Amino acid sequence: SHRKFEHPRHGSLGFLPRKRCSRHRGKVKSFPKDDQQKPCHLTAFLGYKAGMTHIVREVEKPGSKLHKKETCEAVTIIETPPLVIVGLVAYVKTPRGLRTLNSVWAQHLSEDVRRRFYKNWCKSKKKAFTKYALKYDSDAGKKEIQLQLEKMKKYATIVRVIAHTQIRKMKGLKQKKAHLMEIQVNGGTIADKVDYGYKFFEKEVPVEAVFQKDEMVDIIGVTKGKGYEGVVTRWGVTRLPRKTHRGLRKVACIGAWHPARVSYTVARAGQNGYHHRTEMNKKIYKMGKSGQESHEACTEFDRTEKDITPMGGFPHYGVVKGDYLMIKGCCVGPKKRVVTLRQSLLKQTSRLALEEIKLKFIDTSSKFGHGRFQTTDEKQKFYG
Amino acid sequence: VKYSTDPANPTKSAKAMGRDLRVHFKNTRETAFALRKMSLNKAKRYLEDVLAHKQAIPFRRYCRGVGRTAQVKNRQPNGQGRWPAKSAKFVLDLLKNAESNAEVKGLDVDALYISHIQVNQAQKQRRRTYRAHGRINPYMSNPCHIELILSEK
Amino acid sequence: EVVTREYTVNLHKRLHGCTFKKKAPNAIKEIRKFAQKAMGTNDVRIDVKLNKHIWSSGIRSVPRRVRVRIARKRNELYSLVTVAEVPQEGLKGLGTKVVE
Amino acid sequence: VSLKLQKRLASSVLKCGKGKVWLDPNEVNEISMANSRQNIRKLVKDGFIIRKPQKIHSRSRARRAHEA
RNA sequence: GACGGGGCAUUGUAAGUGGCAGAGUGACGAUCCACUGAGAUCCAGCCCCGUCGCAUUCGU
RNA sequence: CAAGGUGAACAGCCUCUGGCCAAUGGAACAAUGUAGGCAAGGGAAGUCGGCAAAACGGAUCCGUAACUUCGGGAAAAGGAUUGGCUCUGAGGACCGAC
RNA sequence: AGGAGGGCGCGGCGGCCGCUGCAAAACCCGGGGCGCGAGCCCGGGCGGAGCGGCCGUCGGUGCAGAUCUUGGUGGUAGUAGCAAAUAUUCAAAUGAGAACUUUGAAGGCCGAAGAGGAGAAAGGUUCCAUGUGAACGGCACUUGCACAUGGGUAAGCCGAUC
Ligand SMILES: [K+]
Ligand SMILES: [K+]
Ligand SMILES: [K+]
Ligand SMILES: [K+]
Ligand SMILES: [K+]
Ligand SMILES: [K+]
Ligand SMILES: [K+]
Ligand SMILES: [K+]
Ligand SMILES: [K+]
Ligand SMILES: [K+]
Ligand SMILES: [Mg+2]
Ligand SMILES: [Mg+2]
Ligand SMILES: [Mg+2]
Ligand SMILES: [Mg+2]
Ligand SMILES: [Mg+2]
Ligand SMILES: [Mg+2]
Ligand SMILES: [Mg+2]
Ligand SMILES: [Mg+2]
Ligand SMILES: [Mg+2]
Ligand SMILES: [Mg+2]
Ligand SMILES: [Mg+2]
Ligand SMILES: [Mg+2]
Ligand SMILES: [Mg+2]
Ligand SMILES: [Mg+2]
Ligand SMILES: [Mg+2]
Ligand SMILES: [Mg+2]
Ligand SMILES: [Mg+2]
Ligand SMILES: [Mg+2]
Ligand SMILES: [Mg+2]
Ligand SMILES: [Mg+2]
Ligand SMILES: [Mg+2]
Ligand SMILES: [Mg+2]
Ligand SMILES: [Mg+2]
Ligand SMILES: [Mg+2]
Ligand SMILES: [Mg+2]
Ligand SMILES: [Mg+2]
Ligand SMILES: [Mg+2]
Ligand SMILES: [Mg+2]
Ligand SMILES: [Mg+2]
Ligand SMILES: [Mg+2]
Ligand SMILES: [Mg+2]
Ligand SMILES: [Mg+2]
Ligand SMILES: [Mg+2]
Ligand SMILES: [Mg+2]
Ligand SMILES: [Mg+2]
Ligand SMILES: [Mg+2]
Ligand SMILES: [Mg+2]
Ligand SMILES: [Mg+2]
Ligand SMILES: [Mg+2]
Ligand SMILES: [Mg+2]
C-alpha cells in the first residue's frame, strides 16, 4: 500500500557512492571553455587552508535592509604562494575523446617536486629526470625539445601547463613533497599558448596572475574524513522510538517484499566524509600580497598594525607569511588540506558577483579560546 | 617409519616426526605451507620473527574471519595473515630435531632446505561445555601429526 | 656504553584521555617506552622507589612531570630507571642532564 | 621456593593474621627449611619472622569534633 | 626527536610570610588585606625557536 | 558473634581487626548495542497510553480545604529557614553529660 | 497400477568336480575384456589361511529414502564466543618455560545482618605432608578441592544414649 504521509527522501543520490575519494588533492574535472580572443592566462591555482575568521563590512546593496549597514561575515584564509611551472602537456582531439599528445619538461626541477615521483625518497638514488636534463646540454637534445614544442603548435587543441607548489614555504605543513597539477591555458591561439607556457619554465606565477579581488571562484577538495558511520548521521534519517528493541539508530524498513533485493536508494551505514566536492561561487574578499600593505589585516577604517594571523597562530596551521586569499564563507576540508581553486565555468553577471567588497574590520583575536585582544601588544599593555 | 614422501636422496637428507601434538591443525597447516621449499636457516629466522610478531603467516584456506595486517602483504596481497605462536613453536622444535639428525649424518647445516613438510589430523580429544536450558555440547581439540624432511638438494 | 642521564618525562600528555583504571599502569608502560627510545635498550628495569612515586596518588592521579635518572649498564645492555632529585624552583629551565 | 606453609604456621604461632606476617625476603632459603612450629619459633626469636604493626586508625578527628 | 623557553588559552589571586584588620572570649579566633590578574594547567590532534640524544621482492 | 566516623539509624558512604585482588590476557576507541549522564528555546505538540525520565524528598517554624463512619483526611495544600566561626542563656549530681 | 515368464546375485544342507603358503578369503586399482542388463571373467597390488564352480533342495537371501536404527564424518568454522561482582603495579627468587607460583614493597576492595570467625543438615577424605608422565582445573601453571604415596579424628564431665 501507499505510504501514509509524504516527506522528501533523505540525502542526494547524486553524490553516490559515499566512498573514500581515490585521490587526496582535489581534481579539476572540467576547465573553463577556451575563448581564443582573450590573452593567454591560467585557469586554476593550488592553495592550503589556513583557518577561519570573521570580518565586518558595510553593505552597498539597494533594495536590501542591509543597505548602508554593516554586516559580520565569516571568511576562510587560503595561503597561496606562487606556483612553479615545470612542464607543458598538449592534447589532441580523437573520436574517443582528448588524448595527451606529448609533454616537455624544464631542465631544472626542485627536489620538492622530484619527491612526488618517489614512495621512499631517502632510500633511492634520486635518479628521476637526471638523464632527461641532458637534452638541454647537447645540441641534438635541444633539437628534440624544439621539435616537441613545434609539434605542440601544429597538432594540439588543448595546451596545459605542469605546475607544482612550493610546499616548504609553509613550515607548519611539515611536508617536503610538493603537489603537482596540470593547469589549462585559456587564451590566444595554440602557438600563443605554447609560447606563453614555455616562457614560464622554472618561474614563479603568483596568485594575482590568475584571480582578482571580488571574483567568484570554485573550490575543489576532499572533505574531512569521519570513518564508519550509521544511517542517522551519514544520511540524516530520523531516530526510532526509545522503546525500540535492538536499538533505535537504524532505518526500520529497508525495502518491500518485492523487488526481493535491497535497492541502491536505501540509506545504509558506511564511510562518511573524505569525499571529493566541487563548490562554486565563493567570492574573493581580499588578496594579500607578501611585501605589500594589503597583506596586513588593517583596513581603511582600522589603522591598527596587525598581521592576518590571529593571536597565537592559526590553530593547527601556523603563521601565514606567503600570499593568501580571503574568501567569503566556509571551504572544503580541514586545516592544512590542499585545495584546488578554479575559475568559474559560467558568466558571473549578477549583483552578488559584481558587488565591490570594502572591509571595515578583520578580527585577529586568538581562535584557541575566547580571545579578547587583537594583538600581543594590546594584551601586554593591558596587564602592565 | 614411512613418511608420505621418500627423500629421493636418503643419504643426503634428515627427517623429524611428531604424533598427536596438542596444537590446532588448521593453524599449523598454514604455517607448514608458508615454508614449503625454504632453506633451513631462513625457515628458522622466519619462525622466530613470527614468534616475535615481526613477520605474519599467510592464511589462504581456513581463513574465514581472519584479520588484515600489512605484515603479510607481500606474497598475500589481501592482508589476511596471523601469528600462530604455538604452531610456530611446535614446528621450530621439529626443525631442531631434524637439524641434529643431519649433524649426526654429517651433512652441513648450511645448504639444507625443507624438501617435505606435512600436517595431518590426529584423533580428536573430548571435553565438555554447558549451554542454556540445561544442554551439553562438545568442546573438542584438533591435534595434528607433523612430518618433516630436510634435504641438501 | 655505560652512561647516566637525567630526563624529565611529560606523563600528562602521554596519558591524556586514558581510562581511569589504567592510568597508573600505563604510566609505568610509558616510562618503559621512554627509556627504550632514549637509551636504545630493550631491557628496562624500573626501580621500586620509582614505582612507588608513580603510584603515590592512587591509580588515577599520576604526576604530570617526573624527573627520572636512566643509567644504562652492561649485563647485552639494560637501562635502570630511578627517581631523580628535584632542585629548588622546580623543573623550570631543566633540560636533559648528564650525570658524572 | 614457596613459603605458604611457613606463613600459615607463623600466623598461628604469632597469633595474628596472615597479612601481618613478615618473612625476611633475604632469608627465603633459611625460612624454607623450617617445617615445624618449633622451627618457626626459633626464626621468630632470631628475627627473621616478625608480626607487622596494626594499620593506624587515629581517633584524633573524633576527639577534635567532639570538643567542637 | 626529548626537555626547556616564549606565544596563545582556561580557572580566578596559590603555598608561605606579614598585618595596631577581625564578632568575641580567656593567648585563641571564621574571615579580611598585602606581596598577588597571582598560582596551576596548556597538545595529548595549538603556534614559534638554552640542555641532551639519534628483512621480503620485482625485468617491460 | 559482630568495632570507629557521619547520621534518628544493623540506611547509604569511608575506615580498623580478619580476609582478599579469583573471575583469560594484550592493542585500539568504527558503526550498531548494553549500562550510565548532560543538553539552548519550547514543554506531552510524542504515544493506545507521560511508557521511560525529570521534578519532590531530611530537619525546624508558620499554616492547612472539601468531605467524614468524628476516628480521619493530613506530611493535605501553601510558605520560610538550614554553612562556618566567636560567644551567650537555660536545663543537674555529689564535678560532670548531652 | 497390476500379473506372469526367463535369468543374475547372497548363505546353508545332500551330492559331484576342483583350488590354495610356488599364497585362499576380504580389500584397492586412469589395468583388460564378456554380457542389453542384473552380473561375470582375467591382470597388478595388499594380505597371510582358507575358498570356489555345477546338480538338487532349503532360507533371518538383494536398499537411496521410512523427521528409519546404531556408529563414524563434513560444511558451518578457526567462526559465535571467553565483557556482572571497581585493580592492579614494581623488584627479586624458582623453574626448560612466569601476566597467573612464592617473598617483599606499593595501590585498591569486602566494611563487620562481611568477600571475617564458627556450627546444624548434606558430602565423605575434599583435611596435612611429600612428589608429579598424561588427563582435568573451558587462557596458562613450576601449580591443585587433579593425580600418586604416606599420615591424621584420644572424652566418666561435649553429644548421642535417658
Ligand atoms: K503502507
Ligand atoms: K549536517
Ligand atoms: K525521531
Ligand atoms: K575478521
Ligand atoms: K597565598
Ligand atoms: K591578588
Ligand atoms: K560503540
Ligand atoms: K500526551
Ligand atoms: K544353493
Ligand atoms: K560419654
Ligand atoms: Mg500518496
Ligand atoms: Mg569532466
Ligand atoms: Mg521492547
Ligand atoms: Mg576555537
Ligand atoms: Mg566477527
Ligand atoms: Mg555456557
Ligand atoms: Mg541446570
Ligand atoms: Mg611550551
Ligand atoms: Mg603532534
Ligand atoms: Mg547479630
Ligand atoms: Mg552523631
Ligand atoms: Mg551503617
Ligand atoms: Mg566471567
Ligand atoms: Mg579483553
Ligand atoms: Mg532541554
Ligand atoms: Mg512551562
Ligand atoms: Mg496527543
Ligand atoms: Mg499524533
Ligand atoms: Mg487513542
Ligand atoms: Mg514513572
Ligand atoms: Mg488529598
Ligand atoms: Mg581411485
Ligand atoms: Mg559363494
Ligand atoms: Mg539362517
Ligand atoms: Mg531381512
Ligand atoms: Mg543404508
Ligand atoms: Mg526405494
Ligand atoms: Mg533425517
Ligand atoms: Mg546416528
Ligand atoms: Mg558439524
Ligand atoms: Mg571472535
Ligand atoms: Mg557474554
Ligand atoms: Mg588475575
Ligand atoms: Mg562499596
Ligand atoms: Mg571501602
Ligand atoms: Mg575454618
Ligand atoms: Mg589442601
Ligand atoms: Mg586448559
Ligand atoms: Mg585424590
Ligand atoms: Mg553432657
Q: How far is CA D34 from CA A114, A265, C86, D17, D28, in A?
A: 77, 81, 46, 19, 10
Q: Count how many Cα atoms sit within 13 Å of the Cα of residue A18 in the half-sphere of its side chain.
A: 24
Distance A113 CA to F47 C1' (A): 64
* Cβ neighbours of B66 (radius 10 Å): 17
Beta partners for residue A228, in sequence order:
A271
Q: Which residues contact A7 (CB under 8 A, 6 or more apart)?
A: none
Report helix, strand or coil for D57.
Answer: coil
H or E segment and range at residue C72:
strand C65-74
Return d(Cα A317, Cα A170) in angstroms, integer: 9
Distance B2 CA to G19 C1' (A): 36
Distance A247 CA to ligand 1 centre (A): 23
Return d(Cα A117, Cα A177) in angstroms, integer: 9
Distance D64 CA to F80 C1' (A): 34
Return d(Cα B49, Cα B56) in angstroms, integer: 8
Report helix, strand or coil for C29.
Answer: helix
Q: How far is CA B139 from CA A170, B91, B127, in A?
A: 62, 25, 5
Q: How far is CA A91 from CA A16, A190, A265, A310, in A?
A: 30, 11, 39, 45
Collect residues with CB below 5 Å from ion ligand 17.
Answer: B 134
Q: Which residues contact A187 (CB under 8 A, 6 or more apart)?
A: A34, A35, A36, A38, A39, A40, A41, A193, A196
Instruction: Quote the cell numbers at residue B131.
Output: 549451554
H or E segment and range at residue C77:
strand C77-83
Q: Are A335 and A310 in contact (CB under 8 A)?
A: no
Distance A168 CA to ligand 18 centre (A): 24
Return d(Cα A136, Cα A377) in angstroms, integer: 54
Return d(Cα A224, Cα A319) in angstroms, integer: 22
Q: Which residues contact A266 (CB under 8 A, 6 or more apart)?
A: A251, A254, A255
Whether nucleic acid strand G comes within 7 Å of the CB of B96, the answer is no
* Cβ neighbours of A273 (radius 10 Å): 17
Return d(Cα C44, Cα A312) in angstroms, integer: 39
Return d(Cα A165, Cα A48) in angstroms, integer: 10
Three-state SS string over C40-57 comes to CCCEEEECHHHHHHHHCC
Residues 331-370 of A with CB under 7 A from strand E: 334, 365-366, 368-370
Return d(Cα C33, Cα C28) in angstroms, integer: 9
Chains contacting C (3+ CB pairs below 8 angstroms) = none
Residue type, A174: K
H or E segment and range at residue C10:
strand C3-10
Whether nucleic acid strand F comes within 7 Å of the CB of D16, the answer is yes
Residue that the C-alpha cell 565569516 belongs to: A74
Return d(Cα A44, Cα A218) in angstroms, integer: 9
Distance A13 CA to G142 C1' (A): 66
First to last CA, chain B: 22
H or E segment and range at residue C38:
helix C23-39
Q: Which residue is nearest to nucleotide E56 (CA to C1')?
A: B74
Instruction: Quote the cell numbers at residue A344.
Output: 568559474
Distance B2 CA to G10 C1' (A): 40
Q: How far is CA B3 from CA B17, B74, B101, B113, in A?
A: 9, 32, 16, 17
Distance B45 CA to ligand 9 centre (A): 72
Residue set of the binding site of B: 130
Q: Are A61 and A68 in contact (CB under 8 A)?
A: no
Return d(Cα A318, Cα A308) in angstroms, integer: 11
Instruction: Quote the cell numbers at residue D2.
Output: 614457596
Collect residues with CB below 5 Å from ion ligand 16.
Answer: B 130
Residue set of the binding site of B for Mg(2+): 130
Instruction: Quote the cell numbers at residue A314.
Output: 592559526
3-state helix vs strand vs coil in chain D, percent to 5: 60, 10, 30
Q: How far is CA A15 from CA A177, A235, A255, in A?
A: 30, 12, 21
Three-state SS string over chain A comes to CCCCCCCCCCCCHHHCCCCCCCCCCCCCCCCCCCCCCCCCCECEEEEEEEEEEEEEEECCCCCCCCCCCEEEEEEEEEECCCEEEEEEEEEECCCCCCEEEEEEECCCCCHHHHHHHCCCCCCCCCCCCCCHHHHHCCCHHHHHHHHHHHHHHHHCCEEEEEEECCHHHCHHHCCCCCCEEEEEECCCCHHHHHHHHHCCECCEECHHHCCCCCCEEEEEEECCEEEEECHHHHCCCCCCCCCCCCCCCCCCCCCCCCCCCCCCCCCCCEEEECCEEEEEEEEEEEEECCCCHHHCCCCCCCCCCCCCCCCCCECCCECCCCCEEEEECCCCCCCCCEEEEEECCCCCCCHHHHCCCCEEEECCCCCCCCCCCCCHHHHHHHHC
Residue that the C-alpha cell 628496562 belongs to: C44
Whether nucleic acid strand E comes within 7 Å of the CB of A91, the answer is no
Q: Are strands C77-83 and C43-46 parallel, antiparallel or unpaired?
A: parallel
Q: Are A50 and A78 in contact (CB under 8 A)?
A: yes
Instruction: Quote the cell numbers at residue A269.
Output: 551505514
Return d(Cα B102, Cα B112) in angstroms, integer: 9
DSSP code at position C26? H
Q: Which residues contact A96 (CB under 8 A, 6 or more apart)?
A: none
Method: cryo-EM
Instruction: Quote the cell numbers at residue D38.
Output: 618449633
Nearest of A198, A212, A239, A193 to residue A41 by alpha carbon: A193
- Which strand G bases fall within 7 angstroms of a protein CB? 73-74, 76-80, 86-94, 101-108, 128-130, 135-138, 143-144
Three-state SS string over chain B comes to CCCCCCCCCHHHEEEEEEEEECCCHHHHHHHHHHCCCCEHHHHHHHHHHHHCCCCCEECCCCCCCCCECCCCCCCCCCCEEECCHHHHHHHHHHHHHHHHHHHHHCCCCCCCEEEEEEEEECCCEEEEEEECCCEEEEEEECCEEEEEEEECC
Residue A32, preceding bond cis, omega within 30 degrees? no
Beta partners for residue C43, in sequence order:
C78
Return d(Cα C38, Cα A110) in angstroms, integer: 35
DSSP code at position C20? G
Distance B138 CA to ligand 17 centre (A): 17
Residue set of the binding site of A for Mg(2+): 29, 367
CB neighbour class for B114 (10 Å; exposed up to 12, middle 13-18, buried from 19): buried
Return d(Cα B92, Cα B96) in angstroms, integer: 6
Return d(Cα A54, Cα C11) in angstroms, integer: 37
Residue A206, preceding bond cis, omega within 30 degrees? no
The long-range contacts involving D5-10, CB below 8 angstroms and separated by at least 24 positions, are D5/D35, D6/D31, D6/D32, D6/D34, D6/D40, D6/D49, D9/D34, D9/D36, D9/D37, D9/D40, D10/D40, D10/D43, D10/D44, D10/D49
Return d(Cα A328, Cα A353) in angstroms, integer: 12
First to last CA, chain A: 76
Q: How far is CA D17 from CA A185, D12, D45, D52, D53, in A?
A: 91, 8, 19, 10, 11
A256 phi and psi angles, rounded to 5 deg: -80, 170
Distance A160 CA to ligand 9 centre (A): 101
Distance D49 CA to ligand 38 centre (A): 72
Residue that the C-alpha cell 596472615 belongs to: D18
Q: Are B40 and B114 in contact (CB under 8 A)?
A: yes
Report helix, strand or coil for C67.
Answer: strand
Beta partners for residue A101, in sequence order:
none
